[PDB]
Write a protein that holds these residues in place. Structure first.
Motif, PDB file in Angstrom:
ATOM      1  N   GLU A   1      -6.770   0.231 -10.353  1.00  0.00           N
ATOM      2  CA  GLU A   1      -7.021  -0.891  -9.456  1.00  0.00           C
ATOM      3  C   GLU A   1      -7.021  -0.436  -8.000  1.00  0.00           C
ATOM      4  O   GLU A   1      -6.468   0.612  -7.667  1.00  0.00           O
TER       5      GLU A   1
ATOM      6  N   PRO B   1       1.023  -0.570  -8.757  1.00  0.00           N
ATOM      7  CA  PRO B   1       0.670  -1.821  -9.434  1.00  0.00           C
ATOM      8  C   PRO B   1       1.899  -2.615  -9.861  1.00  0.00           C
ATOM      9  O   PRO B   1       2.470  -2.370 -10.924  1.00  0.00           O
TER      10      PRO B   1
ATOM     11  N   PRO C   1      -0.309  -7.533 -12.621  1.00  0.00           N
ATOM     12  CA  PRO C   1      -1.293  -8.592 -12.379  1.00  0.00           C
ATOM     13  C   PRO C   1      -0.672  -9.984 -12.431  1.00  0.00           C
ATOM     14  O   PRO C   1       0.546 -10.127 -12.536  1.00  0.00           O
TER      15      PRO C   1
END
Length: 141
Positions: free
Chosen positions: A10, A135, A138
């Motif tokens: 990402e 990360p 999400p």
């Protein structure tokens, strides 16, 4: 069920900040230069990112930076000071910086975070660091 095997890439970007603790005043100095390569949330491509400082483990007293609307590469260059914490201790702690985008519709969408032990960083003097906002996960759905 102890499981979890994921490896997706990402574009969260990276966060720049300086670290340096003083002996005399016995205070910590965390300057958040700015952010770059920050992801968007709105259609057009705007978001209100913001860094959050946390002296882990202790989560009682926490600090954060202002919030810039429609700004992915905003410059905070702010200077904070944590008083009431001796070096011998501040070291046992860890510098936590999370860059989230203050949104209304959604409660909180954490883009990425960074963890660094103040014991490893040469607190003896100001030192910069360049890490890629890991990360933080999400948005559950």
């Amino acid at each position: 069920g102890s499981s979890g095997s994921s490896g997706s890439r990402e574009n969260l970007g990276r966060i720049q900040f300086s670290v340096g603790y003083n002996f005399q005043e016995s205070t910590l100095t965390v300057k958040i230069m700015k952010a770059q390569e920050l992801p968007a949330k709105d259609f057009s491509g705007t978001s209100d990112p913001f860094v959050k400082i946390y002296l882990l483990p202790d989560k009682k007293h926490k600090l954060e930076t202002k919030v810039k609307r429609k700004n992915l590469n905003p410059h905070w260059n702010e200077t904070f000071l944590f008083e009431g914490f001796p070096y011998e201790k501040v070291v046992q702690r860890i510098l936590y910086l999370q860059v989230l985008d203050y949104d209304r519709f959604s409660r909180n969408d954490p883009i990425g975070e960074v963890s660094i032990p103040l014991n490893k960083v040469d607190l003896t003097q100001m030192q910069t660091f360049w890490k890629d906002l890991k990360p933080s996960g999400p948005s559950s759905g």
